[PDB]
Amino acid sequence: GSSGSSGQKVKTIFPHTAGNNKTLLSFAQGDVLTLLIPEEKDGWLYGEHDTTKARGWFPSSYTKLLSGPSSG
């Protein structure tokens, strides 16, 4: 659902696979990732994958802020 403002959502505009590395999040362009930390790892941002259920590190540049919530 929706509860205030937290764990914003971002959308990947470009693909970026990890490749074994367990420090990068593997996803496809369009995939949505749930943010966890309001801060950024020096540009990089953290979140959770809406697939693998695992969380990785990705460049905020390779992600964009969604446009509206998604309650359901």
mmCIF file of N, CA and C in Angstrom, residues 5 14 17 23 26 30-31 33 36-37 40 46-47 50 54-55 66 71:
data_model
loop_
_atom_site.group_PDB
_atom_site.id
_atom_site.type_symbol
_atom_site.label_atom_id
_atom_site.label_comp_id
_atom_site.label_asym_id
_atom_site.label_seq_id
_atom_site.Cartn_x
_atom_site.Cartn_y
_atom_site.Cartn_z
ATOM 1 N N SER A 5 5.907 8.952 2.995
ATOM 2 C CA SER A 5 6.973 8.967 2.008
ATOM 3 C C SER A 5 8.191 8.210 2.540
ATOM 4 N N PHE A 14 18.315 2.132 -18.193
ATOM 5 C CA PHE A 14 19.347 1.379 -18.886
ATOM 6 C C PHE A 14 19.655 0.072 -18.153
ATOM 7 N N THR A 17 23.796 -5.479 -15.654
ATOM 8 C CA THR A 17 23.885 -6.751 -14.957
ATOM 9 C C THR A 17 25.100 -6.765 -14.027
ATOM 10 N N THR A 23 27.654 -7.465 -5.427
ATOM 11 C CA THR A 23 27.641 -6.093 -4.951
ATOM 12 C C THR A 23 26.784 -5.217 -5.866
ATOM 13 N N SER A 26 21.342 -7.025 -10.474
ATOM 14 C CA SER A 26 21.104 -7.429 -11.849
ATOM 15 C C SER A 26 19.624 -7.255 -12.197
ATOM 16 N N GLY A 30 13.679 -0.886 -17.197
ATOM 17 C CA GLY A 30 12.252 -0.812 -16.933
ATOM 18 C C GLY A 30 11.923 -1.349 -15.539
ATOM 19 N N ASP A 31 12.679 -2.359 -15.135
ATOM 20 C CA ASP A 31 12.479 -2.970 -13.833
ATOM 21 C C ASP A 31 12.370 -1.873 -12.772
ATOM 22 N N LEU A 33 12.858 -0.861 -8.729
ATOM 23 C CA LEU A 33 13.578 -1.216 -7.518
ATOM 24 C C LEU A 33 13.114 -0.315 -6.371
ATOM 25 N N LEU A 36 15.824 1.794 -0.141
ATOM 26 C CA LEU A 36 15.848 1.463 1.273
ATOM 27 C C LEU A 36 16.450 2.632 2.056
ATOM 28 N N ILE A 37 17.580 3.115 1.560
ATOM 29 C CA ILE A 37 18.263 4.226 2.200
ATOM 30 C C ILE A 37 17.947 5.518 1.445
ATOM 31 N N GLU A 40 22.687 8.189 -0.708
ATOM 32 C CA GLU A 40 23.294 7.520 -1.846
ATOM 33 C C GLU A 40 24.770 7.229 -1.565
ATOM 34 N N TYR A 46 20.851 2.425 -3.269
ATOM 35 C CA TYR A 46 20.485 1.070 -2.892
ATOM 36 C C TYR A 46 18.969 0.874 -2.958
ATOM 37 N N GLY A 47 18.571 -0.387 -3.050
ATOM 38 C CA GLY A 47 17.159 -0.723 -3.121
ATOM 39 C C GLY A 47 16.960 -2.236 -3.211
ATOM 40 N N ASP A 50 12.397 -6.154 -7.457
ATOM 41 C CA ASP A 50 11.044 -6.682 -7.435
ATOM 42 C C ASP A 50 10.991 -7.973 -8.254
ATOM 43 N N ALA A 54 16.391 -9.805 -3.940
ATOM 44 C CA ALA A 54 17.687 -9.434 -3.395
ATOM 45 C C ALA A 54 17.948 -7.953 -3.675
ATOM 46 N N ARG A 55 18.767 -7.358 -2.821
ATOM 47 C CA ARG A 55 19.106 -5.952 -2.964
ATOM 48 C C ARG A 55 20.576 -5.797 -3.355
ATOM 49 N N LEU A 66 10.363 7.292 -10.001
ATOM 50 C CA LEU A 66 9.083 6.949 -10.597
ATOM 51 C C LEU A 66 8.212 8.204 -10.683
ATOM 52 N N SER A 71 -0.307 2.034 -4.968
ATOM 53 C CA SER A 71 -1.044 1.357 -3.916
ATOM 54 C C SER A 71 -2.004 0.331 -4.524
#
